[PDB]
Amino acid sequence: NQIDLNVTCRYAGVFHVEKNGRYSISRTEAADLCQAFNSTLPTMDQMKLALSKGFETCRYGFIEGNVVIPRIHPNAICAANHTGVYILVTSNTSHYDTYCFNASAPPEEDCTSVTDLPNSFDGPVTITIVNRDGTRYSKKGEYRTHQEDI
């Protein structure tokens, strides 16, 4: 019973979380997941400031109100070569990665590793935070509050 959470650097408190190496998070699960990191879904303004500090990914993820990809450099296979916060307009499907916002993070680029999941609750799942540099933090718990996400 295991969940891998791949996380990034934080940029003005914003970071990306990919679950089990595939698009697999619902909007309800995304809010609960960010809550386990003492974080919330970023607002579009928070995401734009993170972008301006150096944040970009090549994955769709939830923010408040939309599913987006922050882009700095044009890349043909990432958001159809767009720059800025690219907003997903048309999709049949509901599951993506998520972005999260931690207000107590440093103001600009923070590429230190994440070493805790401070606000998960009691549960049976082995949750493993996986950093980009491979370092890991694991703990037994749960973060999903909606049964349909389990």
Ligand SMILES: Cc1ncsc1C(=O)N(C)[C@@H](C)C1CC1
């Ligand atoms: C534990 C941790 N490791 C690096 S920063 C940091 C922290 O204070 N957080 C609140 C983390 C859990 C959020 C991912 C930003």
